[PDB]
Homo-oligomer: A and B are copies of this chain.
């Protein structure tokens, strides 16, 4: 195997929230992931981390104006609702003769398949940005698309016990008669399947492709569950109770929601009254439930310093700046004890 190398950024500056529309909105603690394994990424996102390419970030739930909660669902036990069934029936009628292929494209410029459909994917992304979000065209260039949907620091390891496609980062493309109409970004992990971004052709806006893509990914995860027993979950990115655009993810039930402090999954029905009561609130059904993976031995952290893999306590003697030390300490609390000893904090 290959170790995980990441770099931590304090990121003490506010950012404009894309949901609450505030200058001092989305606040998060960030890091620049150089190369991490899929298991490390899964363990991190189990703690609330979110991927935006090679840059990962954990939102500050205690300070963000619009708290974001990771929500997962169980494709094997999932039961579609009336709206989902109607959307599926409408799509099936549309896909009939009176046609569509789902393609998995790994995120790698060396892959000829990725380069063959790069132009179509970029055009679809531009159309989605200028139609749905109405963003200016100059803000939707090639660099914006690449740095946010094509820079995957996840190692594409393919263990024999895992799926035939393998872990890593992939794109689901919906080819309609040889033409791409919808592209979604999925991260395949041993435990779950994470979702980051999804876009589609605005012209087919009457089919509600945002729900059909989710149903297709649920079916794909359920099919993958036949091979891997540990792969029985599918993340829904983030959930905000004060944003109706993304609040429809709560309609997908049965589902589980990740607690902001205990890092455990609770039923969605139990936390919905808490979510509607206040924007941010610890669930904590019992006051004696602490995180199991919370960092308690920072010396176990592995650091790539002086061109050497050293324990945090061993390399601390060589290091001199104390403030950076604090930046490491919080980093540990944001990654857990297990990830601390498996990820290299590059400082050479």
Contacts and interface: CB of A to CB of B under 8 A. Distances in A.
Contacts of A139: 306-308
A147 B308 contact: no
Contacts of A156: 109-110
B309 A143 contact: yes
B110 A147 contact: no
A143 B304 contact: yes
A250 to B, nearest CB: 27
Contacts of A224: none
A199 B34 CA distance: 25
A144 B307 contact: yes
A307 B307 CA distance: 34
Contact of A143 (B5, B140, B144): B5
Interface residues of A, number: 31
Contacts of A309: 138, 141, 143-144
A108 B110 CA distance: 8
Interface in A33-62: 34, 54
A346 interface: yes
Interface in A262-315: 304, 306-310
Interface in A120-151: 138-144, 146-148, 151
Given A110-B108, A110-B110, A143-B344, A148 B2 contact: no
A147 to B, nearest CB: 7
A310 B5 contact: no
A307 B140 contact: yes
Nearest to A320: B13
Contacts of A306: 139
A116 interface: no
Given A3-B142, A306-B139, A307-B139, A346 B147 contact: yes
A141 B308 contact: yes
Nearest to A148: B307
Interface string A305-346: 011111000000000000000000000000000000000101
Contacts of A344: 143
Contacts of A348: 147
A61 to B, nearest CB: 23
Contacts of A308: 138-141, 144
Contacts of A138: 308-310
B2 A147 contact: no
Given A110-B156, A144-B307, 10 more contacts: A2-B143, A3-B142, A3-B143, A34-B54, A34-B147, A34-B151, A108-B110, A138-B310, A140-B307, A143-B344
10 contacts: A2-B142, A2-B146, A3-B143, A108-B110, A140-B307, A140-B308, A141-B308, A143-B309, A147-B346, A148-B307
* Those 6 A-B pairs whose CB atoms lie nearest each other, nearest first: A139-B308, A110-B110, A144-B307, A141-B309, A139-B307, A143-B304
